[PDB]
Design a protein around this ligand. Structure first.
Ligand SMILES: CC(=O)N[C@@H]1[C@@H](O)[C@H](O)[C@@H](CO)O[C@H]1O
Ligand SMILES: *[C@@H]1O[C@H](CO)[C@@H](O)[C@H](O)[C@H]1NC(C)=O
Ligand SMILES: *[C@@H]1O[C@H](CO)[C@@H](O)[C@H](O)[C@H]1NC(C)=O
Ligand SMILES: *[C@@H]1O[C@H](CO)[C@@H](O)[C@H](O)[C@H]1NC(C)=O
Ligand SMILES: *[C@@H]1O[C@H](CO)[C@@H](O)[C@H](O)[C@H]1NC(C)=O
Ligand SMILES: *[C@@H]1O[C@H](CO)[C@@H](O)[C@H](O)[C@H]1NC(C)=O
Ligand SMILES: *[C@@H]1O[C@H](CO)[C@@H](O)[C@H](O)[C@H]1NC(C)=O
Ligand SMILES: *[C@@H]1O[C@H](CO)[C@@H](O)[C@H](O)[C@H]1NC(C)=O
Ligand SMILES: *[C@@H]1O[C@H](CO)[C@@H](O)[C@H](O)[C@H]1NC(C)=O
Ligand SMILES: *[C@@H]1O[C@H](CO)[C@@H](O)[C@H](O)[C@H]1NC(C)=O
Ligand SMILES: *[C@@H]1O[C@H](CO)[C@@H](O)[C@H](O)[C@H]1NC(C)=O
Lengths: 208, 228, 342
């Protein structure tokens, strides 16, 4: 009923945060802010009406079923997670985190076959590594015998490095020993701004 | 000034029951309903129900029907929440809320201007499981005078956290230990990688040191390239 | 030319000076005699917006009933604010009488005569009256008693159906008698008798009307989720005694899907220690009077609350509501609003 986008927003102080929320039913929509380790705060209610204490940098708008919270000139206190709300329903939430700007860096893509030790257990884990890239926005798609995989992978992203201001991502594909030995080609497709075209690192089961 | 004070955090086991309080002040207590919202990291905030102090009228969310009870004390102006048969999915920070517009004649419930400070509730098994540590072979490619990548996979442990070092902490340059993820089995797992010169793979030894305090587990796994 | 306004109304009734009955005595001092020949001016080419949930006429009747109860149903002991108030609590004659609310000079009441008017929105057929119809201040929960019936179809009333915090009023177009009795010779135990054939048929019609408002979903009834006995049970006053009737059998989903066809008897109980609907706190009264305590009423409306929550089921669940007695007055004052002439 309430679809909030995007999931994560990595911005620098002074920029503008654009958070959208699509509803399946018209009604009074509110926006909340949750600073780290604090109770959520009412920012906007009834679509565009500003709550008490909220600066005019926060503005609410609505076009059709799409409600947008725009936060101009980001400050320290502005960062956190935002939620939209209609009645008892809440959006998934948008995470607005601090991003330190730098030059675009392409990820170094590595793929790791499951160990022979793990194969003894009955499950196999294929790990794709995206190392030291910028910006954070990166997509990883798994392909097994050139077939798109879904629901059997989990991603993990490190915080922005204090030295080089880059990010690193880890995607893990989990399959059973039986289902793993059924297929040959395993691949992860990495799409990133620092890449002219999607990069694919793969291996064939059995061969070295 | 409207205030909502909640009771302290607590830890529970699967099967237990929790009870938290919300003392209200600064307004006519029976004029506005009190809601209970729980927020868990990653998941959307979940409305549990509201309670109207007049006759203690309640309305529970359908998915929590049968496990939740909301009451109140008129003298102390305190609302109470009870959740029974707790599981891991109940792990969250619980809030009591109240609508912005609240008069003696009219109110709007869902504009939550007023929030309690929150009551953290952790529901987890007292059981501990040591991690399995599988090496991540750097593959047999990536140039001759360039960089490689190796690591070890720390899989199926409970609960958080685990810490990884390399060569007893001697190796820190190029190390990335990713945040753990929660698998469907209810067990955690993470990866710790490191990029090293490819020309050192046949000379320098690389060992990941995995530490898991809750299970008293310290395991060292030597990560070496496969021979075929 | 006029505009929606609020003012201090005056009451009118057929109270008798020879009556020692509670409501009569109050109306004697607080109200004027009624008018034998009421004038109603049916307005043509006039469309007016109404809002039963934002009607201040309700906000005046509630004060009157509260003061009525405060000066009549004085409890033996009043528990409020920590303090105890011990007064005299003699047995009295209790039977609500029709009460008319009228506008002073300069003001007038607009009446919506749309047969299928749901409470909020524009009204095509508006008339101009000085006083409202005879409204008995019946204080009850879950069920609306001795009220007015809907003209044509069963009308669902709510300020916002999508808002689960808002009370839902079901206005019946056909009344179903509920016969409550405390026989003579446990003196606090009583019961209510309802024709199961009539009730289940009407209840079935309610579910069908609800389907029109909820995308033909499966309409399910359930007992109250919690609260004081005043709302979890059918709470009402008969002959000065406070009754508490269990209505689990009244909302039986099986009967509206081979056995229910008969006489439904609700377990009742007369309490001395009650929670006051005025919000004051707890009040204690004397034990029930001897003899046959009996009151036969018309079920003319139902107070419901709808379950909400982040779900995705193919059924809507409704539960008997009440508590806010202002809603009782809204069910009768829904077609009225006060306007000021220039
Ligand atoms: C009092 C008056 O003017 N009445 C007329 C009514 O007879 C007619 O049917 C209508 C047409 O819209 O216009 C108006
Ligand atoms: C119903 O609620 C919406 C917002 O939730 C409001 O704009 C609308 O006016 C309400 N309708 C009525 C009839 O009060
Ligand atoms: C309003 O009055 C007109 C005129 O007779 C009538 O045709 C119409 O049915 C009425 N509407 C309602 C809702 O009663
Ligand atoms: C009542 O009718 C009005 C017509 O303007 C409509 O907007 C409103 O939703 C209706 N309410 C119900 C409960 O049917
Ligand atoms: C009860 O209902 C019947 C039939 O609807 C009606 O004739 C009678 O006047 C009602 N009793 C009241 C309003 O006290
Ligand atoms: C009452 O209204 C219902 C529709 O909700 C209708 O089916 C029924 O015939 C009506 N009863 C009457 C007019 O006696
Ligand atoms: C109500 O029920 C009693 C028995 O409980 C019966 O004596 C009485 O006649 C009934 N009243 C009506 C009006 O049916
Ligand atoms: C209930 O009402 C029906 C009419 O709707 C009538 O025929 C029947 O006899 C009544 N039941 C009893 C037990 O009187
Ligand atoms: C009403 O009666 C039913 C059936 O005996 C019972 O299950 C229910 O608990 C009663 N209601 C209350 C509020 O006790
Ligand atoms: C509902 O009606 C059926 C059929 O008469 C009966 O067996 C059942 O006990 C009733 N349930 C309740 C809760 O009244
Ligand atoms: C409703 O019916 C008549 C009034 O006409 C009366 O005998 C009965 O006691 C009334 N019931 C209540 C609850 O006031």
């Amino acid at each position: 009923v309430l679809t909030q986008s995007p999931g994560t927003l990595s911005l620098s102080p002074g920029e503008t945060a654009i958070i959208s929320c699509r509803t399946s039913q018209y009604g009074s929509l509110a926006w909340y802010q949750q600073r780290p380790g604090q109770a959520p705060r009412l920012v906007i209610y009834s679509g565009s009406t500003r709550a008490a204490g909220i600066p005019d940098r926060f503005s609410g708008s609505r076009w059709g079923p799409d409600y947008t919270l725009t936060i101009s000139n980001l400050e320290s206190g502005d960062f956190g997670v935002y939620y939209c709300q209609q009645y008892e329903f809440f959006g998934q939430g948008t995470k607005v985190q601090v991003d330190i700007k730098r030059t675009v860096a392409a990820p170094s893509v590595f793929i790791f076959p499951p160990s022979d030790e793990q194969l003894k257990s009955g499950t196999a884990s294929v790990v794709c590594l995206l190392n030291n890239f910028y910006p954070r926005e990166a997509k990883v798609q798994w392909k097994v015998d050139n077939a798109l995989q879904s629901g059997n992978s989990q991603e993990s992203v490190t915080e922005q490095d204090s030295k080089d201001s880059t990010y690193s991502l880890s995607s893990t594909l989990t399959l059973s020993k039986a289902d793993y030995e059924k297929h040959k080609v395993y691949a992860c497709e990495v799409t990133h701004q620092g890449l002219s075209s999607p990069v694919t690192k793969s291996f064939n089961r059995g061969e070295c | 000034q409207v205030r909502l004070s909640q009771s302290g955090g607590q830890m529970k086991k699967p099967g237990d029951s929790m009870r938290i309080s919300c003392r209200a002040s600064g307004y006519e207590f029976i004029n506005c309903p009190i809601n209970w919202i729980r927020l868990a990291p990653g998941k959307r905030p979940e409305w549990m129900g509201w309670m109207k102090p007049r006759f203690g009228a309640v309305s529970y969310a359908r998915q929590l029907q049968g496990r939740v009870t909301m009451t109140r004390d008129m003298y102390s102006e305190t609302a109470f929440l009870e959740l029974r048969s707790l599981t891991s999915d109940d792990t969250a920070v619980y809030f009591c809320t109240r609508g912005k517009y609240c008069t003696a004649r009219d109110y709007y419930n869902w504009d939550f201007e007023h929030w309690g400070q929150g009551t953290p509730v952790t529901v987890s098994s007292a059981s501990t499981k040591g991690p399995s540590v599988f090496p991540l072979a750097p593959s047999s490619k990536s140039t001759s005078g360039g960089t490689a990548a190796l690591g070890c996979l720390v899989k199926d442990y409970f609960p958080e956290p685990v810490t990884v070092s390399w060569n007893s902490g001697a190796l820190t340059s190029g190390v990335h230990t990713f945040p753990a993820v929660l698998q469907s089995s209810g067990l955690y797992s993470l990866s710790s990688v490191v990029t090293v010169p490819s020309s050192s793979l046949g000379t320098q030894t690389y060992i990941c040191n995995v530490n898991h305090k809750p299970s008293n587990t310290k395991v060292d796994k030597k990560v070496e390239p496969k021979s075929c | 030319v006029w505009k929606d306004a609020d003012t201090t109304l005056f009451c009118a009734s057929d109270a008798k000076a020879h009556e020692t009955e509670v409501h009569n005595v109050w109306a004697t001092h607080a109200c004027v005699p009624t008018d034998p020949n009421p004038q109603e001016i049916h307005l043509e080419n006039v469309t007016e917006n109404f809002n039963m949930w934002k009607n201040n006429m309700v906000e005046q009747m509630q004060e009157d009933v509260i003061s009525l109860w405060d000066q009549s149903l004085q409890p033996c002991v009043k528990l409020t604010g920590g303090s105890v108030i011990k007064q005299a609590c003699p047995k009295i004659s209790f039977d609500p009488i029709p009460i008319h609310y009228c506008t002073p000079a300069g003001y007038v009441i607009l009446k919506c005569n749309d047969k299928n008017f749901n409470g909020t929105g524009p009204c095509k057929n508006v008339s101009s009256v000085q006083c409202t119809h005879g409204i008995k201040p019946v204080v009850s929960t879950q069920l609306l008693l001795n009220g007015s019936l809907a003209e044509e179809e069963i009308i669902i009333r709510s300020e916002n159906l999508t808002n689960n915090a808002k009370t839902i009023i079901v206005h019946l177009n056909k009344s179903v008698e509920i016969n409550c009795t405390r026989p003579s010779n446990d003196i606090r135990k009583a019961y209510c008798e309802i024709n199961g054939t009539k009730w289940n048929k009407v209840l079935k019609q309610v579910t069908e009307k609800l389907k029109e408002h909820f995308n033909n979903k499966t309409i399910i009834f359930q007992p109250p989720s919690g609260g004081d006995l005043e709302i979890t049970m059918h709470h009402f006053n008969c002959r000065g005694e406070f009754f508490y009737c269990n209505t689990t059998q009244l909302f039986n989903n099986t009967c509206i899907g081979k056995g229910c066809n008969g006489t439904i008897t609700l377990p009742c109980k007369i309490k001395q220690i009650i929670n006051m609907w005025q919000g004051t706190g707890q009040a204690m009264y004397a034990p029930p009077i001897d003899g046959k305590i009996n009151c036969v009423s018309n079920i003319t409306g139902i107070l419901l609350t709808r379950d909400g929550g982040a779900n995705n089921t193919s059924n809507e669940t409704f539960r008997p509501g009440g508590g806010n007695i202002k809603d009782n007055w809204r069910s009768e004052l829904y077609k009225y609003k006060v306007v000021q002439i220039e």
